[PDB]
Amino acid sequence: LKCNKLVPLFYKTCPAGKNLCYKMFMVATPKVPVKRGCIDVCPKSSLLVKYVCCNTDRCN
């Protein structure tokens, strides 16, 4: 299981069971996140925190 890499060129890998590709950014910047890797359970978004996570191969 691997997920998109912060850069739209390569991708990161995820341990067995982790098929959620997470992308962490500040709600203020929707399409300009700072990190994108693998997650198995997405955290909780708040006033200034947004973790996007999808359960597929390379989906963040």
Closest C-alpha among 31, 17, 15, 24 to residue 52: 24
Q: Are 20 and 38 in contact (CB under 8 A)?
A: yes
Show me where the domains of the chain are located: 1-60
Alpha-carbon distance values, 32 to 3, 19, 51 (Å):
17, 22, 12
Using alpha carbons only, give the angle 5, 41, 13 rounded to the nearest 5 degrees: 30
Give dist(CA 6, CA 16) in Å, integer.
21
**29 CB-near residues (< 8 Å, 6+ apart):** none
Among 1.50.10.20, 3.65.10.10, 2.10.60.10, 3.20.20.140, what is the CATH number of 1-60?
Answer: 2.10.60.10
Give dist(CA 24, CA 59) in Å, integer.
13
